[PDB]
Amino acid sequence: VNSFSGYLKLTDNVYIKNADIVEEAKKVKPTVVVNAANVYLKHGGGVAGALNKATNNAMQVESDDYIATNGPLKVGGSCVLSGHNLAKHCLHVVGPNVNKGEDIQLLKSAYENFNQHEVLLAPLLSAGIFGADPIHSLRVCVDTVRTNVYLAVFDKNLYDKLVSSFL
Numbered sequence: 001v002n003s004f005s006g007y008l009k010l011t012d013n014v015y016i017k018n019a020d021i022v023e024e025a026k027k028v029k030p031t032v033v034v035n036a037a038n039v040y041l042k043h044g045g046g047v048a049g050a051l052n053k054a055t056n057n058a059m060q061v062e063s064d065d066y067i068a069t070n071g072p073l074k075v076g077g078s079c080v081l082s083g084h085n086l087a088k089h090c091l092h093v094v095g096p097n098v099n100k101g102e103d104i105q106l107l108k109s110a111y112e113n114f115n116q117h118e119v120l121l122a123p124l125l126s127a128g129i130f131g132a133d134p135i136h137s138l139r140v141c142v143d144t145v146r147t148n149v150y151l152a153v154f155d156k157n158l159y160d161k162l163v164s165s166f167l
């Protein structure tokens with residue numbers, strides 16, 4: 001038993017809700033919140049900008065130190081950093097950004113990072129400003145992640161389409 005509430009169960013291990021991940025993160029304090037990161041951990045907009053704003057820019061400060069030490073992530077890769085006031089940990093995961101021409105096949109590699117964590121609150125990778133089809137992202141999530149994932153979808157309209165078209 002865990003504290004996630006109001007989710008629709010899609011599969012054995014994947015759940016979904018119309019929610020603002022920032023507000024869901026502040027209420028659940030999950031062990032892991034996933035950020036829709038880029039390779040530079042520049043949290044300017046989308047989910048990343050919202051999560052970072054909710055940390056009063058502490059996420060960005062920590063991220064800049066991480067990059068200065070380690071260099072950029074790989075597309076499809078991840079790193080674990082602090083969850084600040086939102087979660088114990090933040091798993092920064094880089095999905096491919098279609099608006100940069102990145103290979104959508106890397107989306108599966110991106111979701112594989114979730115399997116290193118037993119339970120996660122997450123957005124749909126490569127959705128929103130990353131330009132991928134959220135219905136495809138949900139399919140890859142379901143077919144790749146084996147650990148327990150609670151997907152927060154900000155847009156109510158989108159959420160209804162994802163549920164209604166789910167196979």
Ligand SMILES: O=C(O)[C@H]1CN(c2ncnc3[nH]c4cc(F)ccc4c23)CCO1
Pocket residue numbers: 019020021022036045046047048049050123124127128129130152153154155
């Ligand atoms: O923007 C993207 O990268 C993806 C995923 N994204 C989200 N998904 C779940 N919760 C979200 N809270 C937000 C607050 C914001 F200010 C901006 C985006 C979100 C958001 C929105 C749709 O497309």
